[PDB]
Design brief:
The PDB classes it as ribosome. This is part of a larger assembly, with chains A, B, C, D and E. Chain D is of the alpha+beta class. Chain D contains 3 helices and 5 strands. In chain D, the strands form 2 sheets. In chain D, strands 1-5-2 form a 3-stranded antiparallel beta sheet, covered by helices on one side. Chain D has a two-stranded antiparallel ribbon with strand order 3-4. Classes of the chains: A little secondary structure, B little secondary structure, C mainly alpha, D alpha+beta, E mainly beta. Chains in contact: B-D, C-E. The structure holds 2 RNA strands.
Chain lengths: ~50, ~25, ~120, ~110, ~100
RNA sequence: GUAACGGGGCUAAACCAUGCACCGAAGCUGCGGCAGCGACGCUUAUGCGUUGUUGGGUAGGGGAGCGUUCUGUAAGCCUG
RNA sequence: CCCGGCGAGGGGAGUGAAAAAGAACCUGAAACCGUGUACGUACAAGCAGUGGGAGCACGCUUAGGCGUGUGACUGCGUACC
C-alpha cells in the first residue's frame, strides 16, 4: 500500500531485443540477418 | 599589440594527371 | 532523455590501461594497442598454466636419473624396482631427497636393487 | 635557499634551446656566465639574461653573497604555437608552425 | 627428523613446528587432525617401508585457518571468428601446524 | 650457399626376428569447486535431500543479468 | 622596490576565504614533450609477452621472512578486423 511497494505479476514484462550491441549479447554484428544478399539489405524483401 | 588572429584556406586539389602510359594496358 | 558517454568510457579505458603496466612503447600508452596486448597475455597465461606441470615433471626425472646413475643404476630399472617393491613415493619427493639427503637415497637404491634382483 | 627566474613565451624552439641549457647544468655561476659569453648561438643570450636576473633576485630579496651560488636546476618547456600559411606550387597550401618555449633557472647558495 | 605423508592427492615432506597448506578439510578451526598413513621417517637411520605405510607411524597437527587464494583470470579467444569469454577463480585451502612426529 | 637424415655425428646410433623395461596429451584416475537435465523422497507448496548423467563451438534459436540519463516514492534522506 | 632596451617577461611587497582565482583568469582528463631518483643495458639475432628465476635497492619484521620496483639467464610462442 505504498507507491514504492507495488510490483507486476511474474512472466509479464519481457525485455525485448536490441541488435548490434556487442559480442556477449548474442546479437551484435549483423543482428540476426546472416551474410550478404537481398534480405540483409535495408528495406529489402519481396512482395506477398 | 600582443594579440594575434588568422584564418584558413582549403581549396585542396584539382586532379587530372597520370600523363604516362597505363600500367597494364590493352 | 539524452545520455552522454563521457564518464563510462573513461572508466573502461583506465581499467584496461591499468593492467598494461611495464609493456614496451605504445603497448602501455595507447588504448588500441594495449587492448590487444592484454588479450594475448591472457591467452598465454591460460596455456602456460598447463605447460608448467610438464616442465616440472621433466626436471624431476632428470635429477633422479643423475642421482641413480651416481649410485650405479639407470632411471628405468630404478623405478621398475621401486614398483616391484611396492613403494609409492612420487617423483617430486624423490628429487628433493636426492638433492638434500644422500643417505636415504642410497638406502632406497639398495632396496630397489634388492627387489629387482 | 632556492631562487627562481623565468622567461615565458620566448621566441625559439625548445629543441634549439636545450642544446645550450646542458652546458651549464651544475656549474658555479661565475664560470657559467663566461661560458655563455663565448658560445655563438642565439639562445645563449636569452639564457644569460635569465641567469643574471635570477642572480639579482637571489641577492636582493633573500640573502647576499653571490660568490657561493650554483646552478641547481634548469629546464625548457614548450609554449603555445602560432599557425601561418605558405603557398606551394600548383595551388597547394601548407601549414607553418612558429614554436615558442618557457625557460626556468634555479640557483642556490647550497 | 622428517616424514612423508599424503593428504590431498599429493605428498608432502614436513618436520616439527612447521606450517603446511593443504586442500580444504571439513574440520573446525580449533581442534587437531591425525594422519595415519606415513610413507617414510628419517633421523640418522631411515625407517622406510617396502609395503607402503610404515606400520606404527602417525603425524599430529591442528588446524590454523581456512581461506581462499589469490584470484586468477581465464580468457578464451578465437581469431576473427567473433568469439571470446572470461571467468575468474579462487581456491580454498587449509593451514595446519605440525606438532609431533611419532615413529 | 653444404641443400635429397632437422642438425651433430653413427659401422651400429642401419635392416630383419623375438622379449622385457621406461618416456610420452587439455585422454583416464585421485583431491577441491561451479552449473544444467532427469529419477526418487521430504516441503508433502518455495524449497530441502539421495543419487545418475551432461557442460568445444561460427550462421542461428532459447533463458537470465549489469551499468547510464530522466519521472514517482521526494518539503523524505546525505552534504560547507 | 629590484633585474631588463624608460622593453617583453619575471622576483618581492600588498588585496582577498583562496593568486596553484592575475585578466592567455571555475574544475582542468588523454595523446604528446621534459627534469630528478632506483634497477637493467655496449659478443648480441625475430608480434616484444607468458611459465621458471638469481642479483640489487627500499619498507616492515622480534630471526623467521614478507611487501614493492627492476630483471641477468632459460622453455613455449608468426598482431587485430
Amino acid at each position: 500500500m505504498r507507491l514504492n511497494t507495488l510490483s507486476p505479476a511474474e512472466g509479464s514484462k519481457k525485455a525485448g531485443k536490441r541488435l548490434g550491441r556487442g559480442i556477449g549479447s548474442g546479437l551484435g554484428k549483423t543482428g540476426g540477418r546472416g551474410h550478404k544478399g537481398q534480405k540483409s539489405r535495408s528495406g529489402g524483401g519481396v512482395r506477398r | 599589440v600582443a594579440v594575434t588572429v588568422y584564418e584558413a584556406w582549403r581549396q585542396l586539389g584539382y586532379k587530372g594527371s597520370w600523363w604516362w602510359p597505363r600500367i597494364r594496358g590493352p | 532523455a539524452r545520455v552522454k558517454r563521457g564518464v563510462i568510457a573513461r572508466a573502461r579505458h583506465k581499467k584496461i590501461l591499468k593492467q598494461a603496466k611495464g609493456y614496451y612503447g605504445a603497448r602501455s600508452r595507447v588504448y588500441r594497442v594495449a587492448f590487444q596486448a592484454v588479450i594475448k597475455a591472457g591467452q598465454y597465461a591460460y596455456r602456460d598454466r598447463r605447460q608448467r606441470k610438464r616442465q616440472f615433471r621433466q626436471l624431476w626425472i632428470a635429477r633422479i636419473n643423475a642421482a641413480a646413475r651416481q649410485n650405479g643404476i639407470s632411471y628405468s630399472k630404478f623405478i621398475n624396482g621401486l614398483k616391484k617393491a611396492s613403494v609409492e613415493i612420487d617423483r617430486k619427493i624423490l628429487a628433493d631427497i636426492a638433492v638434500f639427503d644422500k643417505v636415504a637415497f642410497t638406502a632406497l637404491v639398495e632396496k630397489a636393487k634388492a627387489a629387482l634382483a | 635557499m632556492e631562487t627562481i627566474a623565468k622567461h615565458r613565451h620566448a621566441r625559439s624552439s625548445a629543441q634549439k634551446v636545450r642544446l645550450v641549457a646542458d652546458l651549464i647544468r651544475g656549474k658555479k655561476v661565475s664560470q657559467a656566465l663566461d661560458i655563455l659569453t663565448y658560445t655563438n648561438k642565439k639562445a645563449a643570450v636569452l639564457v644569460k639574461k635569465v641567469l643574471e636576473s635570477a642572480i639579482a633576485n637571489a641577492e636582493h630579496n633573500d640573502g647576499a653573497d653571490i660568490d657561493d651560488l650554483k646552478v641547481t636546476k634548469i629546464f625548457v618547456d614548450e609554449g603555445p604555437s602560432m599557425k601561418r600559411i605558405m603557398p606551394r606550387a600548383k595551388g597547394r597550401a601548407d601549414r607553418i608552425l612558429k614554436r615558442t618555449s618557457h625557460i626556468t633557472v634555479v640557483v642556490s647558495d647550497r | 627428523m622428517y616424514a612423508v605423508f599424503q593428504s590431498g592427492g599429493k605428498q608432502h615432506r614436513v618436520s616439527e613446528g612447521q606450517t603446511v597448506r593443504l586442500e580444504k578439510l571439513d574440520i573446525a578451526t580449533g581442534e587437531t587432525v591425525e594422519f595415519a598413513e606415513v610413507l617414510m621417517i628419517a633421523n640418522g637411520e631411515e625407517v622406510k617401508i617396502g609395503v607402503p605405510f610404515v606400520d606404527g607411524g602417525v603425524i599430529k597437527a591442528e588446524v590454523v585457518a581456512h581461506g581462499r587464494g589469490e584470484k586468477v583470470k581465464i580468457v578464451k579467444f578465437r581469431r576473427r571468428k567473433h568469439y571470446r569469454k572470461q571467468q575468474g577463480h579462487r581456491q580454498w585451502f587449509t593451514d595446519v601446524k605440525i606438532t609431533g612426529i611419532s615413529a
